[PDB]
Amino acid sequence: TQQPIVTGTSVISMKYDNGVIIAADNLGSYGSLLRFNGVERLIPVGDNTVVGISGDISDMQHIERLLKDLVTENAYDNPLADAEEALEPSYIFEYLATVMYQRRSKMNPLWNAIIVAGVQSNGDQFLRYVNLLGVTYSSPTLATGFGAHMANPLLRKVVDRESDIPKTTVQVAEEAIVNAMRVLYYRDARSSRNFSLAIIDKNTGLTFKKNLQVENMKWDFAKDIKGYGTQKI
């Protein structure tokens, strides 16, 4: 049993016609204090998988080290480490899923909610969630913590069921993700303006975008708001 100290907030993701998009802000919160601003919470594994992690950052850094070892260990006595026997999103997920459930079962959890986004070798979009309890699920849209409450509702308007995935482009999907990040910056008190965004396409490969900022914010209407009811000036 433990308690989380330095924490990262929402990780949001969805799948489109050709691949998957995943995003997460660059903040490390120490309770109410917005302590660290240069924190990357999207961990790329090879060139076909991005692991987005929310929760305790100390446990995140541990999982980050476990993944770099999984790459190293996979390359050992493996002449097809960069071809047929490269790490798959499904391989990386099931490993993390196994660890998370073992740790909960020893009453010493990794205080995290993880989304494994990537594209399989056969071009299939992979997107699956796992948390400190070892609970796992897949959906056309996935989001952790606050994202589950605000991001999912918005991303489900673009892809409500499976049949909507081939109808969704990279432009439409990314635009929906970038909008959802702004909405989280409005209403999540443990969120940041600066975020990272990763696209894994089955054609263009892995595109990792750093130092993105929430833009086009509506604040102008604030000037007109005065008092809490009866105040006129």
């Binding site: 080290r65 070892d69 190293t72 390359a75 050992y76 006595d77 002449p79």
Partner: protein, 140 residues
């Protein structure tokens, strides 16, 4: 008398360990493997005896990687070499886990050195039947 060569850790009257020198014969019997240190790196090469046309070309790989920066090739008993690299990999992982930086080549060398030397301290184990050529690039 004699019998100084029947047990591993036993010193002969001339201060030699015959079981170690017998292991060298197993190495000398084996395939030839080399290493060349160039101006900014190292090159490893090995002979692969084609027993028959039935051996799948380019498949039975002998040169093994430790971490991502160290190459290891050996001559003699191939299983004994694999057992040493298995240990080397555990040894390199242990180092990186505590110190963050990937294991320096001299540091890694002594790690294999102490493990192989340990298999000459007791009569309950056999010495390694391989000479291992290894190396790579580090900080300096």
């Amino acid at each position: 008398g004699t019998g100084y060569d029947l047990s591993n850790s036993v010193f002969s009257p001339d201060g030699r360990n015959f079981q170690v020198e017998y292991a060298v014969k197993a190495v000398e019997n084996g395939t030839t493997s080399i290493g060349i240190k160039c101006n900014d790196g190292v090159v490893f090469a090995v002979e692969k005896l084609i027993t028959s046309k039935l051996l799948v070309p380019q498949k039975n790989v002998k040169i093994q990687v430790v971490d991502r920066h160290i190459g290891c090739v050996y001559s003699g008993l191939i299983p004994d070499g694999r057992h040493l690299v298995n240990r080397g990999r555990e040894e390199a992982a242990s180092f990186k886990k505590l110190y963050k930086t990937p294991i320096p080549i001299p540091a890694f060398a002594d790690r294999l050195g102490q493990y192989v030397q340990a298999h000459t301290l007791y009569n309950s184990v056999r010495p390694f039947g391989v000479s291992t050529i290894f190396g790579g690039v580090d900080k300096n």
